[PDB]
Design a protein around this ligand. Structure first.
Ligand code: ATP
Lengths: 231, 588
DNA sequence: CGTTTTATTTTTTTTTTTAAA
């Protein structure tokens, strides 16, 4: 896609050229800060993003995931180009967003699928933290070993018991987290999330009973803790 | 095609809705004008229309409804295209109304495809649970574009072929993303109470509804549904509908005048005579229960229970509150349940029900353990359906030692969480309550403490701030007012006291007072210290357990009575009369 | 003239029932 040409330029012209707030922009330093803490969660703020170029809100939603590819390739190509020193260890990347507009539960519907989202929740019971599979390999005769992994934990959120619509039922939704954004969920807290809406890969697609069994699922690019009860 | 009959009914449909409909102009374009935001697709049209111009060709419409409704949905789109800058992305939602026509017993096989009108209640409900209804695919080979209708319950991913003879079990996975799908919900609903048979029960029936109809339903209301009964392709039965018809524009005693809003309280011009002339209170003591007689203190006191309380502007550190805990006792054979029953007619969310029957699980839901919908739906209940409402109950007497777990929450916590195998959240009690215990042999024999005259639990008589009992006496001239009133109780001519304040003008004026929010820098409000002090001079004798939780009554009753003047800026006099009957409360 | 069949366990709330100085 020849379009893919210009986007990374608009990143590459943006992560190591921009200055805001009277110099030494974070992007010069956050990466290395991340690199010094081995973190892989370098953050963007959409407000600064629109301060430079708000065009990244309107070619995004035809597939924001390819946008995130077009983010991570740039980041990678900055780190190991500038920290080829880094070229040993983990050597993979993704970024974060914090469109800092609060929007609410019980509104995502027919027209909120797989698109630019921003939502909260409140946390309750879920499972441990466990792994998955990642890659396309299994064959040689004419594989279930040496096949890279990625951790996993299930969520469960809940909604504000303060801003309730007066005897409307407290509700519930099934949502996901992933390896790097994991081991921070616990019962009884809230967490503000970038958020993104879809369904299962295939949630029971067939002639069936008098109603399909369909679910709806979300994950976070960014999570920013709202509670933070220590320093 | 036979159904071109209904397409001509759909021609018929267009013919009047695009043409002159009513008012010298259009009826059905402001709907159309509004739908453009998400391509909203929801539009209501009168069924009388099929009488105004179709000339009672409803029987050319009203039978083939699920048969031809699709075509009516096609007509909606064909309307929109004729003038709106349009591509055929427009979908379906048609929500007919105006059917002078109204039940569960009038149901058969035969009732398919109609538009009858029915009303029910809100219970036992399920949430948003969408359906990616449309979608694309093909057989093993090549033809990867199908904008078809895969939505009929008989739908399947693998198909046979489009251009060439292909496999018959293979499938592609395809465009479920640049396309149009739906959303819906599902519940159970029970037979109305305007309709009530002998023997039989308001049996349960189950239904779905559309996006604009969705999550716009609350506790016990009277709406007009659509009679599109439909099959289960399992069978068993179901049904369906598309139209509902459940205070800026004014209540009864009006015609249009001006206010803070359009006609929210506009009719001051007629209210105000009945607002300030403080003997109007006597109408509210006399012209409201003319068919009834008892003490005259209840009939001068309940009103502020019905009416809003404090609702001030103060802290986040702690809540302040308006309503009050309440009771009434005596012994039976004294007409002590007429009134509660009447409230169900008088006032909204006057849910007169027994307490004798209820469980501790009366209030919320308890359990699910199979995939009903999601294996954990324990957020159904009985109380918080008080939509700005109260739950007064009978037979608080033999009740268990668990209900207090909720009543402990009454005026401080008002929050709702459960120690079950589900989750915990909370909710807002909007509600007050009534007390309905009774004594053993009745008489509260005046030799032992009134606490000990029943001797019930520990904190109950801390929280309930007024009890307002009527106890029995034997002086039969008392009794000879009664039957000589019931001289006109059956004798059908003016068989009560002459009134002076209709129910509907009463009920309207209730609101005018609830949007004034008084402001209290009252020097007499500073001399409540002397009021409460001379009170405690009277408390000093007759030596109950008294504190500032009762001061809360000292505050609210008079301040909310200044509301009851439809007034800001509290007036000291309300305190003294408030003092008076409340000076009985220790002597009570 | 060939190439494939088949399993579920623990907890709730009601209405039953049952316990000690
Ligand atoms: N002041 C009064 N006004 C109207 N009716 C009265 C009055 N005093 C007595 N009565 C009559 O006396 C009868 C008392 O019996 P009633 O049916 O009230 O029992 P109840 O109070 O409902 O018992 P409980 O309240 O314990 O259920 C009432 O039906 C009522 O009509």
């Amino acid at each position: 896609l020849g379009p893919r040409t210009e986007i990374a330029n608009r990143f590459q012209s943006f992560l190591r050229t921009f200055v805001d707030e009277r110099g030494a922009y974070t992007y010069r330093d956050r990466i290395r800060r991340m690199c010094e803490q081995n973190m892989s969660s370098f953050v963007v703020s959409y407000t600064d993003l629109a301060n430079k170029e708000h065009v990244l809100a309107y070619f995004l939603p035809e597939a924001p995931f390819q946008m995130l590819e077009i983010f991570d390739k740039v980041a990678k190509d900055m780190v190991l180009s500038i920290f080829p020193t880094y070229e040993r260890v983990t050597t993979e990347i993704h970024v974060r967003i914090s469109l800092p507009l609060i929007e609410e539960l019980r509104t995502f519907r027919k027209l909120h699928l797989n698109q630019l989202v921003r939502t909260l929740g409140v946390v309750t019971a879920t499972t441990g933290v466990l792994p998955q599979l990642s890659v396309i390999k299994y064959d040689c005769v004419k594989n279930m070993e040496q096949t890279l992994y990625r951790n996993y934990q299930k969520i469960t959120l809940q909604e504000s018991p303060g801003r309730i619509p007066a005897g409307r039922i407290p509700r519930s939704k099934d949502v996901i987290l992933l390896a790097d954004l994991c081991d921070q969920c616990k019962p009884g807290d809230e967490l503000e999330v970038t958020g993104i809406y879809t369904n299962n890969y295939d949630g029971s697609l067939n002639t069936d009973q008098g109603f399909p069994v369909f679910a709806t699922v979300i994950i976070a690019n960014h999570v920013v803790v709202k509670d933070s009860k220590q320093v | 095609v036979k159904d071109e009959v209904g397409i001509r009914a759909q021609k018929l449909f267009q013919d009047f809705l695009e043409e002159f409909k009513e008012d010298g102009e259009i009826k059905y374009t402001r709907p159309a004008a509004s739908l453009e935001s998400p391509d909203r697709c929801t539009l209501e049209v009168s069924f009388e229309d099929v009488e105004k111009y179709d000339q009672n060709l409803a029987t050319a419409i009203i039978e083939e409804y699920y048969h031809i409704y699709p075509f009516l949905c096609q007509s909606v789109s064909n309307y929109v295209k004729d003038r709106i800058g349009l591509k055929t992305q427009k979908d379906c939602y048609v929500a007919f109304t105006e059917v002078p026509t109204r039940k569960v017993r009038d149901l058969t096989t035969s009732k398919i495809g109609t538009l009858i009108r029915i009303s029910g209640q809100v219970v036992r409900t399920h949430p948003v649970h969408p359906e990616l209804v449309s979608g694309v695919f093909m057989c093993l080979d090549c033809q990867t574009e199908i904008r078809n209708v895969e939505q009929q319950f008989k739908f399947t991913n693998p198909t046979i072929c489009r251009n060439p003879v292909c496999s018959n079990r293979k499938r592609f996975m395809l465009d479920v993303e640049k396309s149009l799908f739906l959303d819906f919900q599902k519940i159970r609903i029970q037979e109305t109470q305007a309709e009530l048979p002998r023997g039989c029960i308001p049996r349960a029936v189950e239904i779905i509804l559309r996006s604009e109809l969705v999550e716009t339903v609350q506790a016990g209301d009277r709406y007009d549904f659509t009679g599109t009964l439909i099959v289960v392709p399992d069978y068993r039965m179901a049904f369906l509908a598309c139209s509902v018809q459940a205070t800026d524009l004014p209540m009864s005693e009006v015609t249009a005048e001006d206010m803070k809003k359009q006609m929210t309280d506009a009719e001051w011009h007629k209210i105000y005579e009945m607002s300030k002339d403080r003997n109007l209170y006597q109408n509210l003591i006399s012209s409201l229960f003319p068919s009834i007689y008892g003490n005259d203190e209840v009939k001068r006191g309940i009103l502020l229970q019905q009416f809003g309380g404090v609702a001030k502007t103060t802290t986040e550190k702690t809540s302040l509150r308006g309503d009050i805990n309440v009771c009434i006792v005596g012994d039976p054979s004294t007409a002590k349940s007429q009134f509660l029953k009447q409230v169900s007619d008088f006032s909204p969310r006057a849910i007169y029900t027994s307490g004798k029957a209820s469980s501790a699980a009366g209030l919320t839901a308890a359990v699910v353990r199979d995939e009903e919908s999601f294996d954990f739906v324990i957020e159904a209940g009985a109380l918080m359906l008080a939509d700005n409402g109260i739950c007064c109950i009978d037979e608080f007497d033999k009740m268990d030692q668990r209900d207090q777990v909720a009543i402990h929450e009454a005026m401080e916590q008002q929050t709702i969480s459960i120690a079950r195998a589900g989750v915990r959240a909370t909710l807002n009690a909007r509600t007050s309550i009534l007390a309905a215990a009774n004594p053993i042999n009745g008489r509260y024999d005046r030799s032992k403490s009134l606490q000990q005259n029943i001797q019930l639990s520990a904190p109950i008589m801390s929280r309930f701030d007024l009890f307002f009992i009527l106890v029995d006496e034997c002086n039969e001239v008392v009794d000879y007012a009664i039957a000589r009133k019931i001289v006109d109780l059956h004798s059908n001519i003016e068989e009560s006291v002459e009134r002076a304040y209709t129910r509907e003008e009463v009920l309207r004026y209730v609101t005018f007072a609830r949007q004034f929010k008084p402001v209290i820098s009252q020097e007499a409000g500073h001399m409540l210290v002397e009021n409460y002090g001379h009170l405690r001079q009277r408390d000093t004798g007759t030596s109950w357990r008294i504190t500032v939780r009762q001061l809360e009554s000292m505050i609210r009753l008079s301040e909310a009575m200044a509301k009851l003047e439809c007034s800001n800026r509290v007036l000291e006099r309300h305190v003294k009369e408030a003092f008076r009957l409340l000076n009985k409360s220790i002597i009570r």
